[PDB]
Each structure stands twice: as C-alpha cells, then as structure tokens.
Symmetry: none
Subunit: 135 residues, 2 copies
C-alpha cells in the first residue's frame, strides 16, 4: 500500500472521493484551528509546517509538529498554527470516512498520528502529576 498520501492524490488527480479535499493556504503565524472551530475536519499538510499546542500564561505544551504528508484533525482543544507558509488539504470527517473505505492508507496514517499524539499527551500528564506530587 502506498502511504505517501500526496503522491496518491497526485496519481489519482484528486478524483472521485478524493475531490472532496479543498486546499487552503496560511501565512506564517496564522492560526488554522482552535476550540472555536465548528466542524470536525480532517486536514493533510501539503507543504509547510504547523504546530499543535496548548499555551498558557505559565506553561506551554507542544503536542506535535506536522509537516508535508501528515494528517490530523480538529476534534480537540489544541490550537493549530502555521510555522511558515503552509498549504493544507481539508475535508469534513464524513468525507474523510468516504475516502478511507477506498484508500485505507489515509486512515493508517491518521491512526499513527493520533496514537503518537495520544502517547505524548499521556507522558505530559505524568510529568504534571510528578511535579504536583513532589511539591
């Protein structure tokens, strides 16, 4: 299975179920997504780079840096912001599901990203508990 998703899209000429991806460009420092984003969207970074993060007055957490070929979604309270000029391909979760049943590489990549971010987040929780418990 070809897991280079951008190559799959190009080979297929963004056809059929893949036509539901829309492209959007973001300048450096532009915020893509936040808790106030309405839909559950899935997005694929086509070029550039975004951070997925939680920033507070007293502390910051970087959950991931996503670059070309990485897929993720807007279902969480994380902020997502461009680090540099960035182009994404996005679609709603239903259209992503319609793509997956034809091109499972999209979900295999999503499961990897989500599992990685979940694992990271659980380490973060442990680190906070450690410092609370040792204070």
């Amino acid at each position: 299975t070809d897991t280079n998703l951008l190559e799959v899209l190009n080979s297929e000429e963004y056809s059929g179920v893949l036509k539901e991806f829309r492209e959007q460009r973001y300048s450096k420092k532009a915020i893509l997504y936040t808790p106030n984003t309405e839909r559950n969207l899935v997005f694929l970074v086509k070029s550039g780079r975004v951070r997925v993060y939680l920033a507070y007055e007293d502390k910051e957490f970087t959950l991931a840096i996503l670059e070309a070929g990485d897929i993720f979604c807007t279902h969480t309270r994380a902020f997502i912001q461009a680090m540099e000029d960035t182009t994404i391909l996005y679609t709603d979760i239903r259209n992503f599901q319609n793509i997956v049943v034809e091109f499972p590489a999209f979900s295999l990549n999503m499961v990897k990203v989500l599992g990685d971010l979940l694992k990271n987040s659980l380490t973060i929780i442990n680190g906070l508990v450690f410092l609370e418990h040792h204070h």
Copy 2:
C-alpha cells in the same frame, strides 16, 4: 457515520477475517492490559464494556469508556479494565494493518476512539494546569 463495529462482527462477509483474531474473556473489574504489556496488539470489544485509564503515582484518570463494537490497542501507555463481563477479539498490530488494507471499516472506528481519547487527555492537561496554577 456510525463507526461501531457490531454490524461488522455480525456480518457473514467478515466471518473469515475475524477468525484471524484470538478471543479472550474477562470478568468485571479484570485488567485486560497495562502500559507495560509488551505485545503490540489491536483488540475489539465483542461484548461488554471497558474503561481506558491512566494511573501514575497517587492519581488516576479515566480516558474513555469503550462499548461493544469499539476497537483500541496496546502500546498506548494506558490501562484497560473490564466494567462488566467482557469478550474481546485481538490480533497483532502488523496483522491488523494488513487486515485494514482489505477491510478498512476497522480503522474508522479506531480513528474515532483515538480521537476521543486524545480529546479527553487534552482536557485532563487543561484541568491540571488550572488546578496547579499559582501567582
């Protein structure tokens, strides 16, 4: 979209691929797996209900409750406990990834579950930061 896998479990078309999985039964409150489980496995709740949680030092946080027809995996830094008598089907991750190429429905539920777990883990982080903050 309903991503629940009970309809798949009960479909003749999947009866062959489901034979690739092993089965295991658990009584209420039994621990299915822990963060230290060495085997990298994917498991499907065939019947019953399980709790995914984090325990560390003197803290414990429920991350999600998975119903019959939900799928998850080890190697995700989590504990999993039966909330009632439960039967699971499980297979190793490599085999699961091969299954998904042919039968991607399993992966769509996995995306849903992982997305919910990640959402809930970021909620825990957000709460701990507030509860620990000081001037």
